[PDB]
């Protein structure tokens, strides 16, 4: 059973996806935001997220806009759901065909910023703490079409303005850049968790910026999602996370969390939950950015919403048991996993004492050490037996 | 090829005996003095090497000393320099779980000593860059390696190297070399971005950059030219390894331009049709490739020349591309240069932007969305330049 | 250069007609009028046009309308001299085909799918098409337990056997080309590569009537060597048609202009198709472009991209011929022993008994001396590329 | 659980015997004695051992040496009761094979390759092996112009026809299994996927004697669905043998323990093999592990890893069994209409004429209403994973 302390959130665009893919028409009718709010509260979610255009149809008058916001607000009210994050749609409308913030067309860039400032206003009114930015159209199909250097300057220029505004209006938002390697552009700028973290480090107020990595995004490049998250945590830039499934380098599948690379889903939950001193290593929302398969109807939709929560709770339970097992604890010792936490250098030791240590080189028996095994297969087999519920 | 082109090769490239994961070596060992002489002849301006490529692992000092002296004499006679040096922290069994990040504390200590030793030699030969390729840093299984602790230990080791270099006045720059996998299932710092992000966290970051390799980024299906552009933006492109690859599969290390030719073209354009008229990058054009296993030493020398030849041919077409009036017109129609103009007018902030009805309230997005960028046409002129069709 | 009708460049109506609605955004271009399409293509040099039933006649058109459209379309063909070399059927767009056409778990959908194809065969026969292309875009699954692959192959076969029967009985004279694709839109599509599709075809009742229609980008989506797969297809005599386009390895289907993805492989492919045995092309069917003008483009970009497909093919053709005609290349081919592979391993009349008696093939063979000689493959590759760059 | 001889788990001598010399480093383990390997495998529950000629008998051993080795080997087999179900030949290590064995551009290498194999068939037939596996690891190219594929397929076929001839004439009763691989060690390998190999086998003189030996990670190196290709191999009845291991998508060949790569695909694979044609195994040959103990391990890790392969197979078999015996899973299958795919699309005796006559198949078909019904695939996939997780 899911509790509000689990912090499961879903985007309105997930359960609301009508299943219009690149090769066919929608197979499901539109979902009413209010209904979405009641259904999600009912399956155990603690919050909902949305793109401006998901809640208010692009081009709605203020009267309409205002009315929609009012009803949405009531729904949250009655159900107790919160809005931990909001985002802006800078990919759908034809105007953004070459990007929002990095469109070659200057007028588009000015417009994309305005669209976002507005969404920032709504987010602050609803109490959202994080603004996620997915630059889906920032990038190119052809190398000569985009000056990457100029693009990074313009991406930077726009973000610095957004931080200025938030800080000045006192919104207290955190900004999370979401990396993606491709799709819809041939290549997207800031293709991985690594490129997004390096870019953020160059902004004016870098402490307000982090990343929102997505499981399938990193897997589209055949990268290890867990190892990437571990790196993000080391830098302290994991501001939010999108969970879903994918089967390697192919179109973005957005399957239910754990329905793609199951072994990596397990090590991920282990990383987020079996944090230092019992406690999770991560504290924000556990947000599912997935899509109910095109072959399903609304029954299938609610089922898939529950499957995400279910997968996460079953994995947590097995990650917990894994760590708690004295036999795993013995295998961990033999493989020396914790020995990596001991500094390489003795306290106060520098280059000169190290050069003076004959045991670190001149008298070191590399051949003898090179022959001892690490016992890694065995430790790995123990983990899978826990995942399989065989231990 | 001029010394000014700065083409360099690793001793281990032309010297690769072609022993692969599935077969025996098909070529005999290449003598280092010989390699220096042959590389000087093909137009290389410099040579690089791992410690163990030059001095066999475990050579006594007399031997080691002898080899260096001969090596230095060959350098002397041909006029070749040593722009970069590196350390083999991957071959010997002791490094099976990594050098700086091995779970075993004693291997970590030995790894640092092995590198300090190589720094002294590099300093001695005049090398300016120390490249570090952490090929054994990573894992096959997620529960076997604590990534957070591994980054601490990677960081602890690099801080010490810089300390030493700086106290001794060596003036070295450090370039981390990213690779997603092979030999490990997953290697730490898998892409150029992960490596740049990491370097920003060291104690003397100004001393650290990256050494991206064409093929390593392509093993993940990333755009090499686009990652180099970001590296240049951060000013962390300290060195570059050029070669060819055909997408995600084992590391092929083909001659530069024999893998993704279109990306090879846009890369030379980026590196050479720099800022002014000038190159955007001024370091060595280093070829980290392998002569195919099917070749003998005639093939080896041919493959070395092919690297230089691909670069010069692409350079020539990149220049011609940029000088074409038809290309200038296509660039003008695709608004490439408009991206260089700030989004905001000088002195404009969020308050002035919010006051501009034309940036939103009266913005005709429908009308803007209907005009084409003409990117296909621009792409077509680039390719025609590549094929010498214009 | 200039395209002639003998080059046989053809384009799908859905190619230049793609409005650019992708998985993440709305259409950026208005609808293309088919008569206009016929006219525009004639002008850029195409010798034929192809289409899906639903590209020409809107799904759910009354008989009157349908007839109306066809007759206008036939006039334009008439007027311009374009032919219809191939026709295909859309079994992927309408929601009813969400689990497939021919292999839908739902039996009623399979029956409907067959009927929809029968109808296109008739229109096809009437327009003079020689090939029926079948792209089973929704045949596959997202989850392994959801599709019995064996049963699906039975049903796939069952539907194809019937179409062959019909065509033969009506005297249509069609050939059928199955088009493989590894994924998108299904997580996994059945008959994922050219290989799997050829193996399948061999199991049909009148296999001589079935071949494949491989697409450059589909094979590359799995990182396979397109040229090598087409060489195998030709070896089997199953290349009934070909879809040309570009792709940048394993990622979503990009459908770029031919030669705008893997340029080196586009070169070797043109070389294989044209620098066939007896000087002549190894393949004589349509050179069909199944690509999409980028979403960033307007109608000018659209006609520009259509012409680019042709320009790319012709520029590569020209370099492939220069390559083969170069004496230095001839010398490199000889040192690489490329043609020695065409001489049989055994001397005429030799069998295992005579091979076993040859001490020189084993007992006295010096593997070590043979293993030391290089094949000169790098030099040969370098010469190919210099020809491609127009540097020679 | 415990492995029985009835489980038919086999290992190649080269698996537990891999010294861990990779492309970037020296071996981390000392050589394993073949007799010791027989004893150790017998002890963990294997029923058979397989080997390449060069794994048992060092390349170039004189006849007395070779004979002594074989004799000691046979004694160990005798004493442990292990059998030799398949043998193979190394046509990839020696420098002479740098451009392939059967398809080297060099004619003399092709003659030597055939003799190396014939000699191995003799030893196999004497040890009682029933299958000869052929992995053409060096057949291919790094550059397109270096290899004529058509000529290569002719030479490949030429060699294989001779081998069938010899076997049939000697009464060896061997079956031949070609093992596909997309790349590594060559940039591109001929017959890259199970599909390509099946299509090729179909062109031999005696196709009934030929099938495939597909490997889990080889198909995953192309990001293909292994279970789905296995399903197709079974449909063609060409699954002669199988190599089980683990891989993480497109990268170098990892050869991890079976189930340590794509766990979900491993699960549906065991479901297909054991519960295939309903309840009964769809495959009865060896369950062969072609894996490598990680380079980080010592001999204790090697035996642990050999045991992990068997454990993984048995755990998944148990979960696959429970999955199918679950009345809720059955109900989901019914709802998803999985079995309805097994019912012919056409009625008994119905032809195109009758089909064309059925208005319910088209004229009166409500596509729109059918298109709106959900298949319930997500729910079915969730039950499958809950079985795998032991949560049900
Ligand atoms: O591939 C789509 C991407 O994952 C998207 O769903 C974002 O997360 C959203 O635009 C911001 O939350
Ligand atoms: O994949 C091998 C790697 O690219 C290596 O050759 C490095 O470049 C070298 O160890 C540092 O220069
Ligand atoms: O990926 C889509 C596929 O390539 C399609 O365009 C087909 O070729 C058509 O359905 C049959 O011609
Ligand atoms: O990748 C190596 C290949 O998988 C090999 O192990 C073959 O199976 C063997 O040579 C035939 O048995
Ligand atoms: Co996504
Ligand atoms: Co997301
Ligand atoms: Co490399
Ligand atoms: Co390198
Ligand atoms: Co396509
Ligand atoms: Co196509
Ligand atoms: Co293998
Ligand atoms: Co194998």
mmCIF file with all atom_site columns, N, CA and C in Angstrom, chain A residues 194 197-198 200-202 206 209 230-238, chain B residues 151-152 154-156 158-159 176 189 193-209 236:
data_model
loop_
_atom_site.group_PDB
_atom_site.id
_atom_site.type_symbol
_atom_site.label_atom_id
_atom_site.label_alt_id
_atom_site.label_comp_id
_atom_site.label_asym_id
_atom_site.label_entity_id
_atom_site.label_seq_id
_atom_site.pdbx_PDB_ins_code
_atom_site.Cartn_x
_atom_site.Cartn_y
_atom_site.Cartn_z
_atom_site.occupancy
_atom_site.B_iso_or_equiv
_atom_site.pdbx_formal_charge
_atom_site.auth_seq_id
_atom_site.auth_comp_id
_atom_site.auth_asym_id
_atom_site.auth_atom_id
_atom_site.pdbx_PDB_model_num
ATOM 1   N N  . UNK A 1 194 ? 24.756 13.920 -17.684 1.00 0.00 ? 194 UNK A N  1
ATOM 2   C CA . UNK A 1 194 ? 26.085 14.556 -17.584 1.00 0.00 ? 194 UNK A CA 1
ATOM 3   C C  . UNK A 1 194 ? 26.174 15.920 -18.258 1.00 0.00 ? 194 UNK A C  1
ATOM 4   N N  . UNK A 1 197 ? 24.084 18.548 -16.266 1.00 0.00 ? 197 UNK A N  1
ATOM 5   C CA . UNK A 1 197 ? 24.756 18.976 -15.038 1.00 0.00 ? 197 UNK A CA 1
ATOM 6   C C  . UNK A 1 197 ? 25.885 19.935 -15.399 1.00 0.00 ? 197 UNK A C  1
ATOM 7   N N  . UNK A 1 198 ? 26.734 19.624 -16.373 1.00 0.00 ? 198 UNK A N  1
ATOM 8   C CA . UNK A 1 198 ? 27.821 20.532 -16.732 1.00 0.00 ? 198 UNK A CA 1
ATOM 9   C C  . UNK A 1 198 ? 27.285 21.899 -17.148 1.00 0.00 ? 198 UNK A C  1
ATOM 10  N N  . UNK A 1 200 ? 24.437 23.551 -16.263 1.00 0.00 ? 200 UNK A N  1
ATOM 11  C CA . UNK A 1 200 ? 23.832 24.209 -15.080 1.00 0.00 ? 200 UNK A CA 1
ATOM 12  C C  . UNK A 1 200 ? 24.841 24.926 -14.201 1.00 0.00 ? 200 UNK A C  1
ATOM 13  N N  . UNK A 1 201 ? 26.051 24.375 -14.170 1.00 0.00 ? 201 UNK A N  1
ATOM 14  C CA . UNK A 1 201 ? 27.222 24.802 -13.437 1.00 0.00 ? 201 UNK A CA 1
ATOM 15  C C  . UNK A 1 201 ? 27.684 26.144 -14.014 1.00 0.00 ? 201 UNK A C  1
ATOM 16  N N  . UNK A 1 202 ? 27.274 26.493 -15.204 1.00 0.00 ? 202 UNK A N  1
ATOM 17  C CA . UNK A 1 202 ? 27.650 27.755 -15.845 1.00 0.00 ? 202 UNK A CA 1
ATOM 18  C C  . UNK A 1 202 ? 26.604 28.864 -15.710 1.00 0.00 ? 202 UNK A C  1
ATOM 19  N N  . UNK A 1 206 ? 23.658 28.993 -9.951  1.00 0.00 ? 206 UNK A N  1
ATOM 20  C CA . UNK A 1 206 ? 23.681 27.537 -10.146 1.00 0.00 ? 206 UNK A CA 1
ATOM 21  C C  . UNK A 1 206 ? 23.039 26.752 -9.032  1.00 0.00 ? 206 UNK A C  1
ATOM 22  N N  . UNK A 1 209 ? 19.535 25.574 -9.746  1.00 0.00 ? 209 UNK A N  1
ATOM 23  C CA . UNK A 1 209 ? 19.404 24.629 -10.849 1.00 0.00 ? 209 UNK A CA 1
ATOM 24  C C  . UNK A 1 209 ? 19.953 23.221 -10.661 1.00 0.00 ? 209 UNK A C  1
ATOM 25  N N  . UNK A 1 230 ? 23.399 8.102  -9.504  1.00 0.00 ? 230 UNK A N  1
ATOM 26  C CA . UNK A 1 230 ? 24.419 8.086  -8.444  1.00 0.00 ? 230 UNK A CA 1
ATOM 27  C C  . UNK A 1 230 ? 25.341 9.292  -8.601  1.00 0.00 ? 230 UNK A C  1
ATOM 28  N N  . UNK A 1 231 ? 25.698 9.574  -9.850  1.00 0.00 ? 231 UNK A N  1
ATOM 29  C CA . UNK A 1 231 ? 26.549 10.719 -10.178 1.00 0.00 ? 231 UNK A CA 1
ATOM 30  C C  . UNK A 1 231 ? 25.777 12.008 -9.854  1.00 0.00 ? 231 UNK A C  1
ATOM 31  N N  . UNK A 1 232 ? 24.529 12.109 -10.258 1.00 0.00 ? 232 UNK A N  1
ATOM 32  C CA . UNK A 1 232 ? 23.671 13.266 -10.016 1.00 0.00 ? 232 UNK A CA 1
ATOM 33  C C  . UNK A 1 232 ? 23.577 13.539 -8.510  1.00 0.00 ? 232 UNK A C  1
ATOM 34  N N  . UNK A 1 233 ? 23.381 12.512 -7.713  1.00 0.00 ? 233 UNK A N  1
ATOM 35  C CA . UNK A 1 233 ? 23.329 12.607 -6.259  1.00 0.00 ? 233 UNK A CA 1
ATOM 36  C C  . UNK A 1 233 ? 24.677 13.109 -5.716  1.00 0.00 ? 233 UNK A C  1
ATOM 37  N N  . UNK A 1 234 ? 25.790 12.589 -6.205  1.00 0.00 ? 234 UNK A N  1
ATOM 38  C CA . UNK A 1 234 ? 27.134 13.002 -5.771  1.00 0.00 ? 234 UNK A CA 1
ATOM 39  C C  . UNK A 1 234 ? 27.316 14.508 -5.939  1.00 0.00 ? 234 UNK A C  1
ATOM 40  N N  . UNK A 1 235 ? 26.776 15.090 -6.993  1.00 0.00 ? 235 UNK A N  1
ATOM 41  C CA . UNK A 1 235 ? 26.811 16.508 -7.338  1.00 0.00 ? 235 UNK A CA 1
ATOM 42  C C  . UNK A 1 235 ? 25.707 17.286 -6.599  1.00 0.00 ? 235 UNK A C  1
ATOM 43  N N  . UNK A 1 236 ? 24.729 16.547 -6.081  1.00 0.00 ? 236 UNK A N  1
ATOM 44  C CA . UNK A 1 236 ? 23.573 17.138 -5.379  1.00 0.00 ? 236 UNK A CA 1
ATOM 45  C C  . UNK A 1 236 ? 22.691 17.899 -6.334  1.00 0.00 ? 236 UNK A C  1
ATOM 46  N N  . UNK A 1 237 ? 22.515 17.352 -7.526  1.00 0.00 ? 237 UNK A N  1
ATOM 47  C CA . UNK A 1 237 ? 21.697 18.034 -8.542  1.00 0.00 ? 237 UNK A CA 1
ATOM 48  C C  . UNK A 1 237 ? 20.483 17.203 -8.865  1.00 0.00 ? 237 UNK A C  1
ATOM 49  N N  . UNK A 1 238 ? 20.145 16.202 -8.078  1.00 0.00 ? 238 UNK A N  1
ATOM 50  C CA . UNK A 1 238 ? 18.950 15.418 -8.410  1.00 0.00 ? 238 UNK A CA 1
ATOM 51  C C  . UNK A 1 238 ? 17.768 16.205 -7.847  1.00 0.00 ? 238 UNK A C  1
ATOM 52  N N  . UNK B 2 151 ? 33.594 8.277  -7.061  1.00 0.00 ? 151 UNK B N  1
ATOM 53  C CA . UNK B 2 151 ? 33.864 9.652  -7.504  1.00 0.00 ? 151 UNK B CA 1
ATOM 54  C C  . UNK B 2 151 ? 34.724 10.391 -6.490  1.00 0.00 ? 151 UNK B C  1
ATOM 55  N N  . UNK B 2 152 ? 34.543 10.112 -5.216  1.00 0.00 ? 152 UNK B N  1
ATOM 56  C CA . UNK B 2 152 ? 35.345 10.686 -4.121  1.00 0.00 ? 152 UNK B CA 1
ATOM 57  C C  . UNK B 2 152 ? 36.816 10.282 -4.271  1.00 0.00 ? 152 UNK B C  1
ATOM 58  N N  . UNK B 2 154 ? 38.105 9.042  -7.074  1.00 0.00 ? 154 UNK B N  1
ATOM 59  C CA . UNK B 2 154 ? 38.664 9.522  -8.365  1.00 0.00 ? 154 UNK B CA 1
ATOM 60  C C  . UNK B 2 154 ? 39.170 10.945 -8.149  1.00 0.00 ? 154 UNK B C  1
ATOM 61  N N  . UNK B 2 155 ? 38.359 11.716 -7.434  1.00 0.00 ? 155 UNK B N  1
ATOM 62  C CA . UNK B 2 155 ? 38.630 13.113 -7.079  1.00 0.00 ? 155 UNK B CA 1
ATOM 63  C C  . UNK B 2 155 ? 39.833 13.229 -6.129  1.00 0.00 ? 155 UNK B C  1
ATOM 64  N N  . UNK B 2 156 ? 39.900 12.366 -5.115  1.00 0.00 ? 156 UNK B N  1
ATOM 65  C CA . UNK B 2 156 ? 41.017 12.372 -4.179  1.00 0.00 ? 156 UNK B CA 1
ATOM 66  C C  . UNK B 2 156 ? 42.350 12.183 -4.886  1.00 0.00 ? 156 UNK B C  1
ATOM 67  N N  . UNK B 2 158 ? 43.096 12.726 -8.269  1.00 0.00 ? 158 UNK B N  1
ATOM 68  C CA . UNK B 2 158 ? 43.378 13.814 -9.200  1.00 0.00 ? 158 UNK B CA 1
ATOM 69  C C  . UNK B 2 158 ? 43.840 15.073 -8.460  1.00 0.00 ? 158 UNK B C  1
ATOM 70  N N  . UNK B 2 159 ? 43.260 15.380 -7.308  1.00 0.00 ? 159 UNK B N  1
ATOM 71  C CA . UNK B 2 159 ? 43.671 16.546 -6.512  1.00 0.00 ? 159 UNK B CA 1
ATOM 72  C C  . UNK B 2 159 ? 45.162 16.444 -6.134  1.00 0.00 ? 159 UNK B C  1
ATOM 73  N N  . UNK B 2 176 ? 40.671 14.299 -18.819 1.00 0.00 ? 176 UNK B N  1
ATOM 74  C CA . UNK B 2 176 ? 40.027 13.015 -18.528 1.00 0.00 ? 176 UNK B CA 1
ATOM 75  C C  . UNK B 2 176 ? 39.448 12.494 -19.860 1.00 0.00 ? 176 UNK B C  1
ATOM 76  N N  . UNK B 2 189 ? 31.949 7.995  -15.694 1.00 0.00 ? 189 UNK B N  1
ATOM 77  C CA . UNK B 2 189 ? 32.134 9.197  -16.544 1.00 0.00 ? 189 UNK B CA 1
ATOM 78  C C  . UNK B 2 189 ? 32.033 8.747  -18.014 1.00 0.00 ? 189 UNK B C  1
ATOM 79  N N  . UNK B 2 193 ? 30.026 14.949 -21.359 1.00 0.00 ? 193 UNK B N  1
ATOM 80  C CA . UNK B 2 193 ? 29.289 15.748 -20.363 1.00 0.00 ? 193 UNK B CA 1
ATOM 81  C C  . UNK B 2 193 ? 29.531 15.316 -18.929 1.00 0.00 ? 193 UNK B C  1
ATOM 82  N N  . UNK B 2 194 ? 29.504 14.016 -18.686 1.00 0.00 ? 194 UNK B N  1
ATOM 83  C CA . UNK B 2 194 ? 29.719 13.417 -17.360 1.00 0.00 ? 194 UNK B CA 1
ATOM 84  C C  . UNK B 2 194 ? 31.128 13.780 -16.919 1.00 0.00 ? 194 UNK B C  1
ATOM 85  N N  . UNK B 2 195 ? 32.064 13.761 -17.855 1.00 0.00 ? 195 UNK B N  1
ATOM 86  C CA . UNK B 2 195 ? 33.478 14.099 -17.510 1.00 0.00 ? 195 UNK B CA 1
ATOM 87  C C  . UNK B 2 195 ? 33.666 15.576 -17.188 1.00 0.00 ? 195 UNK B C  1
ATOM 88  N N  . UNK B 2 196 ? 33.006 16.461 -17.934 1.00 0.00 ? 196 UNK B N  1
ATOM 89  C CA . UNK B 2 196 ? 33.076 17.909 -17.714 1.00 0.00 ? 196 UNK B CA 1
ATOM 90  C C  . UNK B 2 196 ? 32.432 18.233 -16.359 1.00 0.00 ? 196 UNK B C  1
ATOM 91  N N  . UNK B 2 197 ? 31.239 17.704 -16.117 1.00 0.00 ? 197 UNK B N  1
ATOM 92  C CA . UNK B 2 197 ? 30.533 17.913 -14.855 1.00 0.00 ? 197 UNK B CA 1
ATOM 93  C C  . UNK B 2 197 ? 31.461 17.511 -13.716 1.00 0.00 ? 197 UNK B C  1
ATOM 94  N N  . UNK B 2 198 ? 32.104 16.371 -13.785 1.00 0.00 ? 198 UNK B N  1
ATOM 95  C CA . UNK B 2 198 ? 33.024 15.882 -12.755 1.00 0.00 ? 198 UNK B CA 1
ATOM 96  C C  . UNK B 2 198 ? 34.198 16.804 -12.474 1.00 0.00 ? 198 UNK B C  1
ATOM 97  N N  . UNK B 2 199 ? 34.888 17.225 -13.505 1.00 0.00 ? 199 UNK B N  1
ATOM 98  C CA . UNK B 2 199 ? 36.069 18.102 -13.442 1.00 0.00 ? 199 UNK B CA 1
ATOM 99  C C  . UNK B 2 199 ? 35.742 19.399 -12.749 1.00 0.00 ? 199 UNK B C  1
ATOM 100 N N  . UNK B 2 200 ? 34.537 19.919 -12.906 1.00 0.00 ? 200 UNK B N  1
ATOM 101 C CA . UNK B 2 200 ? 34.107 21.177 -12.261 1.00 0.00 ? 200 UNK B CA 1
ATOM 102 C C  . UNK B 2 200 ? 34.112 21.038 -10.748 1.00 0.00 ? 200 UNK B C  1
ATOM 103 N N  . UNK B 2 201 ? 34.206 19.860 -10.175 1.00 0.00 ? 201 UNK B N  1
ATOM 104 C CA . UNK B 2 201 ? 34.192 19.606 -8.748  1.00 0.00 ? 201 UNK B CA 1
ATOM 105 C C  . UNK B 2 201 ? 35.555 19.365 -8.139  1.00 0.00 ? 201 UNK B C  1
ATOM 106 N N  . UNK B 2 202 ? 36.637 19.459 -8.886  1.00 0.00 ? 202 UNK B N  1
ATOM 107 C CA . UNK B 2 202 ? 37.969 19.203 -8.322  1.00 0.00 ? 202 UNK B CA 1
ATOM 108 C C  . UNK B 2 202 ? 38.435 20.489 -7.648  1.00 0.00 ? 202 UNK B C  1
ATOM 109 N N  . UNK B 2 203 ? 39.518 20.322 -6.925  1.00 0.00 ? 203 UNK B N  1
ATOM 110 C CA . UNK B 2 203 ? 40.128 21.453 -6.204  1.00 0.00 ? 203 UNK B CA 1
ATOM 111 C C  . UNK B 2 203 ? 40.695 22.495 -7.144  1.00 0.00 ? 203 UNK B C  1
ATOM 112 N N  . UNK B 2 204 ? 41.418 22.208 -8.211  1.00 0.00 ? 204 UNK B N  1
ATOM 113 C CA . UNK B 2 204 ? 41.946 23.215 -9.149  1.00 0.00 ? 204 UNK B CA 1
ATOM 114 C C  . UNK B 2 204 ? 41.411 22.910 -10.565 1.00 0.00 ? 204 UNK B C  1
ATOM 115 N N  . UNK B 2 205 ? 40.147 23.207 -10.746 1.00 0.00 ? 205 UNK B N  1
ATOM 116 C CA . UNK B 2 205 ? 39.428 22.917 -11.977 1.00 0.00 ? 205 UNK B CA 1
ATOM 117 C C  . UNK B 2 205 ? 40.023 23.544 -13.206 1.00 0.00 ? 205 UNK B C  1
ATOM 118 N N  . UNK B 2 206 ? 40.665 24.678 -13.019 1.00 0.00 ? 206 UNK B N  1
ATOM 119 C CA . UNK B 2 206 ? 41.269 25.339 -14.196 1.00 0.00 ? 206 UNK B CA 1
ATOM 120 C C  . UNK B 2 206 ? 42.334 24.441 -14.820 1.00 0.00 ? 206 UNK B C  1
ATOM 121 N N  . UNK B 2 207 ? 42.846 23.479 -14.056 1.00 0.00 ? 207 UNK B N  1
ATOM 122 C CA . UNK B 2 207 ? 43.890 22.590 -14.577 1.00 0.00 ? 207 UNK B CA 1
ATOM 123 C C  . UNK B 2 207 ? 43.329 21.352 -15.285 1.00 0.00 ? 207 UNK B C  1
ATOM 124 N N  . UNK B 2 208 ? 42.017 21.150 -15.168 1.00 0.00 ? 208 UNK B N  1
ATOM 125 C CA . UNK B 2 208 ? 41.390 19.955 -15.748 1.00 0.00 ? 208 UNK B CA 1
ATOM 126 C C  . UNK B 2 208 ? 40.415 20.199 -16.889 1.00 0.00 ? 208 UNK B C  1
ATOM 127 N N  . UNK B 2 209 ? 40.478 19.317 -17.867 1.00 0.00 ? 209 UNK B N  1
ATOM 128 C CA . UNK B 2 209 ? 39.621 19.323 -19.047 1.00 0.00 ? 209 UNK B CA 1
ATOM 129 C C  . UNK B 2 209 ? 39.382 17.870 -19.477 1.00 0.00 ? 209 UNK B C  1
ATOM 130 N N  . UNK B 2 236 ? 36.761 23.422 -22.165 1.00 0.00 ? 236 UNK B N  1
ATOM 131 C CA . UNK B 2 236 ? 37.405 22.254 -21.516 1.00 0.00 ? 236 UNK B CA 1
ATOM 132 C C  . UNK B 2 236 ? 37.950 21.277 -22.539 1.00 0.00 ? 236 UNK B C  1
#
